[PDB]
Design an enzyme around this catalytic site. Structure first.
Site, PDB file in Angstrom:
ATOM      1  N   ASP A   1       0.826  -1.193   0.000  1.00 56.56           N
ATOM      2  CA  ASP A   1       0.000   0.000   0.000  1.00 56.56           C
ATOM      3  C   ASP A   1       0.867   1.253   0.000  1.00 56.56           C
ATOM      4  OD1 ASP A   1      -2.847   1.231   0.665  1.00 56.56           O
ATOM      5  OD2 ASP A   1      -1.459   2.097   2.139  1.00 56.56           O
TER       6      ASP A   1
ATOM      7  N   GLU B   1       0.881  -1.013  -5.217  1.00 61.99           N
ATOM      8  CA  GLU B   1      -0.158  -0.003  -5.409  1.00 61.99           C
ATOM      9  C   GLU B   1       0.528   1.317  -5.687  1.00 61.99           C
ATOM     10  OE1 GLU B   1      -1.927   2.183  -2.402  1.00 61.99           O
ATOM     11  OE2 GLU B   1      -3.652   2.810  -3.587  1.00 61.99           O
TER      12      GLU B   1
END
Ligand SMILES: OC[C@H]1O[C@@](CO)(O[C@H]2O[C@H](CO)[C@@H](O)[C@H](O)[C@H]2O)[C@@H](O)[C@@H]1O
Ligand SMILES: OC[C@H]1O[C@@](CO)(O[C@H]2O[C@H](CO)[C@@H](O)[C@H](O)[C@H]2O)[C@@H](O)[C@@H]1O
Ligand SMILES: OC[C@H]1O[C@H](O)[C@H](O)[C@@H](O)[C@@H]1O
Ligand SMILES: OC[C@H]1O[C@](O)(CO)[C@@H](O)[C@@H]1O
Ligand SMILES: OC[C@H]1O[C@](O)(CO)[C@@H](O)[C@@H]1O
EC number: 2.4.1.4
Length: 628
Positions: free
Chosen positions: A286, A328
């Site tokens: 993330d 991501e």
């Protein structure tokens, strides 16, 4: 810099001579030692590039390697078999057999036990990959949907226990499904013990975050920082009750971890090892772009950020080889692709393809999509895109202005149109989306709403079902691992009540995070319903993808269709795909098809298509032609 052999001898010094002799003859030590030989030089090189001659580098590294050995030693033998399998099959991620789905445990299934009860449905759908949204303890009320983590070890009790999670992962593996979870490593919640103790002046957590006495440095940094949630706060900093300022790229309750402190790398590597030994197959990395800061820069995509991710990669090659990374990076495509590498993140989200699918539905012109598939699709060996249609987040229009300019398109103006179109502020639009983070300083805006809402299903647009099929067909067939936003496969609409929850009302992303719709799922086998039409058609495409080797791998070549409304591309010189993005019939001429075989079987509709005559596609029709 120390060598792997020296470091291994010191790892063993914790044992008595008798214990040590046993360890050195063991299978686990043999494997760990081999992987140290192969992969430690990378780990050392990457860490050296970031931390240099920092006094703490060698002590941290030795602590980390000692932990890595204990972790690998403890690692379950079944997981060690997956380690070996993937160590000798790096392209498992590229197999056409793989199809993924993502869901929130609470929204989709109530809790972890409920999720375990949905695993037969996941098998029914054909999933081989399941991303579960953030599972661990987080602030009450507002937590950015779990992305503000208060503990990396303790499961959110609303979802169940760590024991429940273990049962889920084992049950997924039993069902032939990889377990995918978030590694939220750029930031913690402000309620995390590390954050509390750092702010409180605990010397053990000194420099775990970026905290400033006043606005002097925050003002300087903010000259070059992008605003991710401008609705929430300006720039990249938030003020504490005591008057200090802390780096908060995202919400004010998400504090950026300080990777310029090598002990923070060590702390998060330990968290990674913990997740690995739960049996997690893929970690979603993330906010990868943000893990290094430097005054005068955007503090995104810096060289040290990449090096740290490559360092994490090496730790897995040493102590949990089965564990792959999904990057991501939602940004300019020149920067997105840099995270994808066998030694960095082996797979990564493909926001370019995703954003341009939606673009093409609005404009009816495949120009930008064709450009992207031609020049930005193919990847290095042993890596893959994750191709998707929607996610838990808003849609950002992250095509390249430079690319668009070659086509005579102004990026700024075009985004203005796409934003108007997809929130139903453009004459005739079929989309029913919601704005997200309109930034009055830059004119930027993103779009919230489910796939079904964005294609017109909320108002029963007769083209809605076929639009969903077309979008997913491209994600399923271009090459890469396709990811279904679960709920899409029965046409789930927006949570129209999202704005009434005061914990959600300032975050329109909740519009496209609805709960499991029992009524729609109950009709998935009913051809008389939109739900059943969508489900059966998506399921058919999944079945074809997974069974037909012509879809294998991640490479494609585009095909010039000579129709501005029709995309075309070829997989493995054997599968010719056409997608019509017009709401009207559109033709590929016999002239355009001259080089093709005389006839071809279409896997979508099942008929044999004559390619020696004009080929007319119905509105939004997809064709998957076997040309070898
Ligand atoms: O056998 C390795 C070698 O290490 C020496 C110390 O220089 O002892 C170390 O290794 C022992 C066995 O692991 C430890 O018990 C000891 O604490 C450690 O210093 C020698 O004693 C030994 O021969
Ligand atoms: O507009 C609906 C609803 O969305 C929330 C927050 O996501 O705000 C979004 O929409 C506003 C209106 O265009 C934008 O100004 C804002 O930037 C966007 O996030 C709520 O503020 C709003 O009520
Ligand atoms: O009005 C519609 C037009 O608006 C903008 O100019 C867009 O760039 C263009 O793609 C679109 O066709
Ligand atoms: O590569 C084979 C793979 O197929 C799966 O079942 C789905 O990901 C994995 O658990 C397994 O490793
Ligand atoms: O590989 C597919 C090929 O096989 C045939 O059906 C028979 O040879 C051809 O029409 C087609 O091009």
């Amino acid at each position: 810099s120390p060598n792997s052999q020296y470091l291994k001898t010191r790892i063993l010094d914790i044992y008595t001579p008798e214990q040590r002799a046993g360890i050195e003859k063991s299978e686990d030590w043999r494997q760990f030692s081999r992987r140290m030989h192969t992969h430690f030089p990378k780990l050392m090189n990457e860490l050296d590039s970031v931390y240099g001659n920092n006094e703490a580098l060698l002590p941290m590294l030795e602590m980390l390697l000692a932990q890595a050995w204990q972790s690998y030693s403890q690692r379950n033998s079944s997981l060690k078999d997956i380690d070996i399998a993937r160590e000798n099959n790096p392209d498992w991620i590229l197999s056409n057999k793989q199809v993924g789905g993502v869901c929130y445990v609470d929204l989709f299934a109530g809790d972890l036990k409920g999720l375990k009860d949905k695993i037969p449905y996941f098998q029914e759908l054909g999933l081989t990959y399941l991303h579960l949204m953030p599972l661990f303890k987080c602030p009450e009320g507002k937590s950015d949907g779990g992305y503000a983590v208060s503990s990396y070890r303790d499961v959110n009790p609303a979802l169940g226990t760590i024991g429940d999670l273990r049962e889920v992962i084992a049950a997924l593996h039993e069902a032939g499904i990889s377990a995918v979870v978030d590694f939220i490593f750029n930031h913690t919640s402000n309620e995390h013990e590390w954050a509390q103790r750092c702010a409180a002046g605990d010397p053990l957590f000194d420099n775990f975050y970026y905290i400033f006495p006043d606005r002097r440095m925050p003002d300087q940094y903010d000259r070059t920082l992008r605003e991710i949630f401008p609705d929430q706060h300006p720039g990249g900093f938030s003020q504490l009750e005591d008057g200090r300022w802390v780096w908060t790229t995202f919400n004010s309750f998400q504090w950026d971890l300080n990777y310029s402190n090598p002990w923070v790398f060590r702390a998060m590597a330990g968290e990674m090892l913990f997740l690995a030994n739960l049996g997690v197959d893929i970690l979603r990395m993330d906010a990868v772009a943000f893990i290094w800061k430097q005054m005068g820069t955007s503090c995104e995509n810096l060289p040290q950020a990449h090096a740290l991710i490559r360092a994490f990669n090496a730790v897995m090659r040493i102590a949990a080889p089965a564990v792959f990374f999904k990057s991501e990076a939602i940004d300019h495509p020149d920067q997105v692709v840099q995270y994808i590498g066998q030694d960095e993140c082996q797979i990564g989200y493909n926001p370019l393809q995703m954003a341009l699918l939606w673009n093409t539905l609005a404009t009816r012109e495949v120009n930008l999509l064709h450009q992207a598939l031609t020049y930005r699709h193919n990847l290095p060996e042993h890596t893959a895109w994750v191709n998707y249609v929607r996610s838990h987040d808003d849609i950002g229009w992250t095509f390249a202005d430079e690319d668009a300019a070659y086509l005579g398109i102004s990026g700024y103006d075009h985004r203005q149109f796409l934003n108007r179109f997809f929130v139903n502020r453009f004459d005739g639009s079929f989309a029913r989306g919601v704005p997200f983070q309109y930034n009055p300083s830059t004119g930027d805006c993103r779009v919230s709403g489910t796939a079904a809402a964005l294609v017109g299903l909320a108002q029963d647009d007769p083209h809605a079902v076929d639009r969903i099929k077309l979008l997913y067909s491209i994600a399923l067939s271009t090459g890469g691992l396709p990811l279904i936003y679960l709920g899409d496969e029965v046409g789930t609409l927006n949570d129209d009540d999202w704005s009434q929850d005061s914990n959600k009302s300032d975050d329109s992303r909740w519009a496209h995070r609805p709960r499991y719709n029992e009524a729609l799922y109950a009709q998935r086998n009913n051809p008389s319903t939109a739900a059943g039409q969508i489900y059966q058609d998506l399921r058919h495409m999944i079945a074809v993808r997974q069974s037909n080797p012509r879809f294998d791998g991640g490479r494609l070549v585009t095909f010039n269709t000579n129709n501005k409304h029709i995309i075309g591309y070829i997989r493995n010189n054997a599968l010719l795909a056409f997608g019509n993005f017009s709401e009207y019939p559109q033709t590929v001429t016999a002239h355009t098809l001259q080089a093709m075989p005389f006839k071809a079987h279409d896997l979508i509709g099942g008929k044999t298509i004559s390619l020696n005559q004009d080929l007319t596609l119905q509105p939004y029709q997809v064709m998957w032609l076997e040309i070898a």
